[PDB]
Specification:
DNA polymerase, domain 1; Matrix protein p15; about 0% strand; about 60% helix; 5 helices; about 120 residues; mainly alpha
Amino acid sequence: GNGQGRDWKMAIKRCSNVAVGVGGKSKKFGEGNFRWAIRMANVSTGREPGDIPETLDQLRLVICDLQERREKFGSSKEIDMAIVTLKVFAVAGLLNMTVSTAAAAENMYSQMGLDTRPS
């Protein structure tokens, strides 16, 4: 629960290069995107609104719970945006791995087996 730390800002800064669209013909991820995605995920999964994931493991738990909810209740433009936004924050932010688009981050998140729930 700390979206004010300097490590948090560096994570967002890394994700500033990532595009929401599949090409160079789109927007760039902003800090508002991630705060919205995290908050929307916390409320949906019985977490406190302002709970900020510190480690990668914490974020994966949120993503797993959110994807599970999408599997049970259904998909939508909002919940898909939230899930992919967290995955971008996971790959390009915490792991610091260069991805061009959100689709690339989504693809890297799966290949590295991050979809699997930790223990």
